[PDB]
């Protein structure tokens, strides 16, 4: 069976002051705050007792700084609870000794109780509680004044009724350490009348003008317009800062070379610095990849080429051209967490106001975890965040799960949301989805088509148009396509 | 005496009024549809006038979209 609940008396039992403390000897009285001795040892021994007054468990502590917990110590524990039902104002301690301070200060006449396991089981010993708290017109939390202590008040008041919490703020780590010769004035300032804060996300509209107008002017309806389609931009409008785009298709290439071009417009024609985490290649591999996109030319693919532009000075010459203003910039490898910190560095240091993620489907670092499927939405959300939390327009690229169905990818089928990987974060948390199909053995193996699948701004959805891929170029040129 | 009839009117069709007399506090009205934005502007326009014809305060929880977007 459990520890049994320490006999007053049986233990060498008094209610002695704690000089230690500034708590009278009438005060631990009150509370039940006993100080015994049991085998030699001398301790000291807090009665918690339920609402009904009888005593369900105790705190016993040692010296040098021991405990021992008798009874059953249930998850709903308030040290002090038995001595109030119902009035106008609790004071909520996060330790024993702290309530005995409260207890002091006020002459005990009112409510002060303590938490049950206090520091981190704020949570579950509050809302253990709601009932009995609401008896209460409001609750002063009166918790540690660090870290683990202003996150208690957090939790706390979380789970703890309605707009009654306020939030104690003193001078020192707690509330004994203020009276410890201090600032006993200062708690005292607090249960009356204290700091009633808890909205930390909520937000009057009144209180956004600014933020508002200053949105107003800096991003724009037709945020930056998708290049090498129009349809692209007349069904979507383009990628507002902020959004979250989603690209997305079989086997294609045709998609990496896609999100490429558009990294190389917004990134030269327009004046914005894309940043590029191409998670597949290396940084070198996708500059130059770059370069020859920039250039119509296949660079990385033709030996002589390379050879030609290195000694004929114009490697360095198309290198300054395109990157010399210092506006594209690329994240470079070999966890989630650290990756998603990296591309906001480049948002909130470099400042770039495009991030393209070359494919989501690289999850990686942090291994002893199931489903893709799970993560994969774990992930969407930190970034759609990223993304309206700081307008940058993230583009994520996105590869296809594979049919089971007769016809593939190649074959050109096409795409539905249903049709998506995930298992629904990206499948919503993404603003606008642009699918590319292409029918690689085919009439046009070269032509590729692009559904709009979905787009929150507009909700202007469908086929948008086609484009052609120029092996010779590189590049998916615009076509004259429809019926 | 305490619990009312015409709770907060519909607006944009009678006809939600009609069938379902308004939105009754304490109850949990459920907006749904297909791909609708329509959707997403019905709850607007009701936001919008229950919080300026009528008296009523409004909070949005609005999941999608950035506090200063729907503001827009």
Same mark, same amino acid.
């Not at 609870?81 to 106008?88: A, M, T």
């Not at 709009?452 to 086929?463: A, E, M, P, S, V």
């Given at each position: 069976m459990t520890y049994n609940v320490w006999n007053f008396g049986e233990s060498n039992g008094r209610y002695s002051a704690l000089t230690a403390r500034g708590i009278s000897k009438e005060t631990c009285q009150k509370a039940g705050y006993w100080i015994a001795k049991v085998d030699g040892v001398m301790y000291q021994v807090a009665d918690y007792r339920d609402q009904n007054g009888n005593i369900v468990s105790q705190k016993v502590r040692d010296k040098d700084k021991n405990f021992k917990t008798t009874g059953s110590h249930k998850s709903d524990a308030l040290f002090g609870?038995?001595?109030?039902? !119902? !009035?106008?104002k609790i004071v909520v301690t996060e330790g024993e000794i702290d309530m005995l301070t409260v207890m002091e200060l006020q002459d005990c006449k009112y409510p002060v109780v303590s938490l049950g396991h206090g520091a981190s089981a704020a949570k579950k010993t509050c809302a253990a509680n709601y009932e009995y708290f609401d008896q209460f017109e409001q609750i002063i939390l009166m918790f540690d004044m660090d870290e683990a202590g202003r996150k208690a008040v957090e939790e706390a008041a979380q789970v703890l009724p309605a707009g009654k919490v306020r939030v104690a703020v003193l001078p020192c780590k707690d509330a004994n350490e203020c009276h410890l010769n201090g600032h006993d004035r200062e708690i005292m300032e607090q249960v009356w009348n204290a700091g009633p804060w808890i909205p930390d996300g909520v937000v009057s509209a009144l209180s956004l003008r600014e933020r508002i107008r200053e949105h107003l002017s800096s991003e724009e309806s037709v945020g930056l317009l998708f290049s090498g389609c129009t349809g692209i931009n007349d069904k979507t409008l383009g990628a507002r800062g902020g959004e979250v785009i989603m690209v997305t298709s079989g086997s294609g290439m045709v998609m990496s070379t896609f999100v490429r071009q558009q990294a190389l417009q917004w990134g030269t024609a327009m004046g914005k610095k894309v940043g590029l985490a191409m998670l597949e290649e290396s940084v070198e591999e996708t500059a130059e990849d770059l370069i020859g996109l920039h250039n119509r030319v296949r660079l990385r693919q033709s030996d002589s080429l390379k050879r030609e532009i290195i000694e004929n000075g114009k490697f360095d010459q198309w290198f300054d051209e395109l990157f010399g203003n210092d506006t594209f910039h690329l994240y470079d490898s070999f966890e989630t967490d650290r990756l998603l910190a990296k591309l906001a560095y480049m948002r909130s240091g470099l400042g770039c106001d495009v991030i393209i993620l070359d494919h989501i489907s690289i999850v990686v670092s942090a291994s002893g975890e199931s489903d893709e499927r799970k993560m994969i939405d774990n992930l969407m959300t930190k970034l759609k965040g990223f993304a309206k939390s700081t307008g940058v327009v993230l583009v994520v690229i996105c590869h296809l799960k594979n049919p #089971?169905? !007769?016809?593939?990818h190649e074959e050109g089928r096409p795409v539905s949301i249903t049709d998506l990987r995930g298992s629904g974060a990206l499948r919503q948390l993404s603003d606008t989805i642009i699918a590319l199909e292409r029918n690689q053995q085919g009439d046009m193996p070269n032509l590729v088509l692009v559904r +709009?699948?979905?787009?929150?701004?507009?909700? #202007?959805? !469908? +086929?948008a148009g086609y484009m052609e891929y120029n092996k010779e170029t590189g590049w998916l040129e615009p076509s004259s396509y429809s019926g």
């Open positions: 609870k038995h001595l109030w039902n !119902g !009035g106008k #089971d169905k !007769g016809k593939a +709009i699948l979905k787009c929150r701004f507009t909700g #202007d959805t !469908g +086929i």
